[PDB]
Amino acid sequence: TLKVDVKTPAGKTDGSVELPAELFDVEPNIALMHQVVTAQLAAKRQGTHSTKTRGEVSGGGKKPYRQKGTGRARQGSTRAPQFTGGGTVHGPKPRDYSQRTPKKMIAAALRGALSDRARNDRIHAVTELVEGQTPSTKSAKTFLGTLTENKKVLVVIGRTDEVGAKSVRNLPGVHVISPDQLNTYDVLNADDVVFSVEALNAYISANSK
Amino acid sequence: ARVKRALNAQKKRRTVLKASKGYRGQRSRLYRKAKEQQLHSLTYAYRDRRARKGEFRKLWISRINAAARANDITYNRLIQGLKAAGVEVDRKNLAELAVSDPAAFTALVDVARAALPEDVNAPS
Amino acid sequence: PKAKTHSGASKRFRRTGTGKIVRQKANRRHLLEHKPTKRTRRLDGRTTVSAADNSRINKLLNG
Amino acid sequence: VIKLHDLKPAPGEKKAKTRVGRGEGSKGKTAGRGTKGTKARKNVPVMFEGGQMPIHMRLPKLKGFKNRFRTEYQVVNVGDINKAFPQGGTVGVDELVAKGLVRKNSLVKVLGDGKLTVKVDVTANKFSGSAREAITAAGGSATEL
RNA sequence: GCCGUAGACGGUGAGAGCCCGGUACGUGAAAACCCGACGUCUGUCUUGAUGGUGUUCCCGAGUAGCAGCGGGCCCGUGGAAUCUGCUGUGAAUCUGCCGGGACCACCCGGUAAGCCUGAAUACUUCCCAGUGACCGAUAGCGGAUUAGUACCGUGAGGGAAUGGUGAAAAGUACCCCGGGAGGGGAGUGAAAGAGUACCUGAAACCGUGCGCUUACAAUCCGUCAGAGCCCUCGACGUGUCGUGGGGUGAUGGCGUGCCUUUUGAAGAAUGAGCCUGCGAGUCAGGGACAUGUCGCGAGGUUAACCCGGGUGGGGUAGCCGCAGCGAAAGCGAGUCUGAAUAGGGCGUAUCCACACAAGAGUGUGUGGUGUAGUGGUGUGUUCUGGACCCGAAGCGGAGUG
RNA sequence: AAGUCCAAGAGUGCGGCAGUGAGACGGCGGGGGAUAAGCUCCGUGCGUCGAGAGGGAAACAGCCCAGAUCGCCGGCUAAG
RNA sequence: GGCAGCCAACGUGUUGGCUGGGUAGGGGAGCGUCCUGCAUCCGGUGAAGCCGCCGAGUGAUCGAGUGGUGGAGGGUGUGGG
């Protein structure tokens, strides 16, 4: 059970949080994590691509000329695929790419991602992002700079904390998310996972209860 | 994702057309005719790489026979005599001696004649 | 669209506890007078579908 | 640390798709169909045998009817009960579905396959003769619902 | 250096958070309309409710029911229930009547032949705001350009082609040749190898110049040897060799195009004038079988739907596995046939050891070891769909002549 | 009973995916035909072509020699 | 002398023995094109495209080798379509 110390914007250390082994010390599974992230991106993609087949191309309902005698190739429609302006034989149609991966697979992949982060000591707990009631990207940037020097950092902030969300929203490499919506893609995208304390306890309680 | 075939197609087209330079007529200008002539040309090259060894050996045998008869011996008897005397020179270098070193060729003729049997038509 | 099972195949063939496909024998409905009882007795009951028909029978039964 | 570019599929996971009719190198100008015919263009139905009486039509239909009023039971053997209840005790349908031995809301009949060596108080919809004797011999009651 | 509740997206002379329109975040309605709220106003109950006791009347008529002929139901007339159209016949008001798959009895349910009713559901001509592992001018709508236009048809109707100078026209003043067109100077411009025939500018095709070769010669037009001439890279002397490289080739050997389709084609069988673009095994479904790989595992897994600006979290209804045999009642590690402990069929995952029998092929009993499925996803086939692509003569419906 | 046995890439069982189901000539045994056909129908642990290049038969799918992984301006042979 | 397939021997990838014509067809492994997640690099001191030279690989092909023309976007690795 690895420990994590809580920091404050003032720079002091509030307390410690105990990361459960069952959540932050599972062995990573590269193939499983790859399957889950690929499924997430497939669900993300929208397949609003379309082409008109030989049927829905306008016109072309008449035989252009006689079957015999003209000395030309036989044609049955001026919209046949081989015609310029004709329909498309096997073209894109709108389709849904999302797949149904089991909840156990999803949860195990998330546990593996967060466990790797914990193993390489990249999880940070914070009592609050900026001093309350007013957003300040300057204050948030300074605090996050003292926290981690890496480029892309994930911030796990509760739904009701507007000050922290608005404060770290505009930073280039920073991604702000809710503890309920933690997902493998975001966790693996980030270099560091900065938890608010209440978000950490909410996640731990929800997953261990 | 609509893909344009231009780059992929022109690759092979340029390769074949460059390989077909110096051909006569349509075979050096048009990709399809050049392709057909390339099929035939590589078939011919593969066949003549095998047949060239035989052609050169035929040339060597002709020169060896000419020189040997100049030395008053026939090719078949000279070859039998050289085989008997244990000389391991091959026909390429025998023709080289014939053209370049007539005295050495005569010495080899004499060795072969000496190693030949007394009567070549004897049943032994 | 779901796949539809062949009605005649369903009515003609059944499966055993291990997966053997089982059929009935022909030449038994009528004209039974001139058939001896020995030939009648080998024509009833069930027999396993021969290995040649296994694939097509399975196809018809499943879909 | 594991990043997004370090994720690879398991070996043997993904197999390259067979693209057909793309030159004489792989599967050209016919796509594995051979020369002309019916199969060269469309397909052949499974129930078709060339014109003769098909196999599904030249055999008698299986005898009998279905009896939609059939009472079907979900069965559990005394061996499984012995394995799952080492300490004995009362055994009803609720705990029989709790230990994952029968389906949730079905009718249970108990069959006497294995060996019963524990004191157990079984309640079920129906019992077989062997199961009832085997339960009784170990000092248990076969209470029938 | 600075801002950041603003690092969305575009423009501006080439990749701009700090130049511009903007963006986050706030503000704004005279009038019209649309929502609500409180009222005038309208209606209704207040000559009013209750818990009880015993009998007559009423409870939807050309209706229900029945018969004939049909329709529709999983049900193709079948034993044909329920619903319903036309033609006949034609009842009772509650111990009545209708349904419980012919029908009858009993029990159960309901109360037809009167009428209204929101939400959950379906769709987008049109308006606003957005998005794309969608197209980028032979694509994408037929239509980025005069587009239902030009053109074709008597008519119904059919139905195109055509985008890009430059950062800015700064679009070449003036002179010369020329009737003009077009050009040469001179100027603009970073570029005129950007000159309104204009970004880039490929191939077919058509020229001009240079090098080698060709007018005694029977050539699927090449290939392998190869003299001579020419051009280069090195070493050395005045031109001669090399681990060389290129271009042409006098002359010698060998040599019957490509594809389809065939017993067999160079074939005097089929297709192709040439180039450049375009043009054929795809997708959907918890579909079926098989085979990889990943999760869980005697279990696996959710569908609809609910809550999240997301890919996340819930959701046990179902499905598959877990016992089989039998037409079925049923019985169950057995079961069916059968009068049979008498044989056979199917089944008890499979193996090992030990006994008992038999050498009619091995069987029967005791012990152990113990049983593997299911859900995602890649691949190959398959089913239903136009289903790898192209092609008839012809058949229907509605219209135009 | 042996042989081959770092191979025939042999047999048998099950399963996934097929194509084929128009053959030709040559040698032997036959039918039909006139003991004609480059005819037609069969048999053949017979062959080759089909699906097979190289050498010979002047040229010449089916005859004879011989089964082409590639290179060599090495040698020995087969039919001829 | 070079390559490949099957198998054996010994070892932490070499040696050896056999084998390597092929249509319909079955199986295995790859080149090139575009669009993308992620990570890196090049580009008005000149990207792509096109035309050459000099070369390279067993094949589809390659040139983060170089000239010309051109004027604004590309390359690479590892996955997805």
From Swiss-Prot, chain A:
Highest taxon in the source lineage: Bacteria
Cellular component annotations (GO), alphabetically ordered: ribonucleoprotein complex; ribosome
Family annotation (InterPro entries): Ribosomal_uL4, Ribosomal_uL4-like, Ribosomal_uL4_dom_sf
Keyword Transit peptide: no
Molecular function terms from GO: rRNA binding; structural constituent of ribosome
Keyword rRNA-binding included in the entry's annotation: yes
Annotated TM spans: none
Positions of region (Disordered): 42-99
Gene Ontology terms: biological process: translation
Pfam families assigned: Ribosomal_L4
Keywords: Ribonucleoprotein, Ribosomal protein, RNA-binding, rRNA-binding
Function: One of the primary rRNA binding proteins, this protein initially binds near the 5'-end of the 23S rRNA. It is important during the early stages of 50S assembly. It makes multiple contacts with different domains of the 23S rRNA in the assembled 50S subunit and ribosome.
Family label: Belongs to the universal ribosomal protein uL4 family.
Subunit structure: Part of the 50S ribosomal subunit.
HAMAP family with a match to the protein in the record: Ribosomal_uL4_B (MF_01328_B)
Record's protein name: Large ribosomal subunit protein uL4
Biological source species: Mycolicibacterium smegmatis (strain ATCC 700084 / mc(2)155)
Gene: rplD
UniProtKB/Swiss-Prot annotation, chain B:
InterPro entries, A to Z: Ribosomal_bL20, RIBOSOMAL_L20_CS, Ribosomal_protein_bL20_C
GO MF term list: rRNA binding; structural constituent of ribosome
UniProt GO BP: ribosomal large subunit assembly; translation
CDD domains in UniProt: Ribosomal_L20
Keywords for the protein's UniProt record, in alphabetical order: Ribonucleoprotein, Ribosomal protein, RNA-binding, rRNA-binding
GO CC annotation: ribonucleoprotein complex; ribosome
Stated family: Belongs to the bacterial ribosomal protein bL20 family.
Function: Binds directly to 23S ribosomal RNA and is necessary for the in vitro assembly process of the 50S ribosomal subunit. It is not involved in the protein synthesizing functions of that subunit.
Name the record gives this protein: Large ribosomal subunit protein bL20
Source organism: Mycolicibacterium smegmatis (strain ATCC 700084 / mc(2)155) (Mycobacterium smegmatis)
UniProtKB/Swiss-Prot annotation, chain C:
Database matches in InterPro entries: Ribosomal_bL35 (IPR001706), Ribosomal_bL35-like (IPR021137), Ribosomal_bL35_CS (IPR018265), Ribosomal_bL35_sf (IPR037229)
Compositionally biased spans, kind Basic residues: 1-41
Highest taxon in the source lineage: Bacteria
Span list, region Disordered: 1-63
Short name of any one Pfam family annotated for the protein: Ribosomal_L35p
Keyword vocabulary terms for this entry: Ribonucleoprotein, Ribosomal protein
HAMAP family named among the record's database cross-references: Ribosomal_bL35
Listed name of the protein: Large ribosomal subunit protein bL35
Species for this entry: Mycolicibacterium smegmatis (strain ATCC 700084 / mc(2)155) (Mycobacterium smegmatis)
Taxonomic placement: Bacteria, Bacillati, Actinomycetota, Actinomycetes, Mycobacteriales
Name of the gene encoding the protein in the UniProt record: rpmI
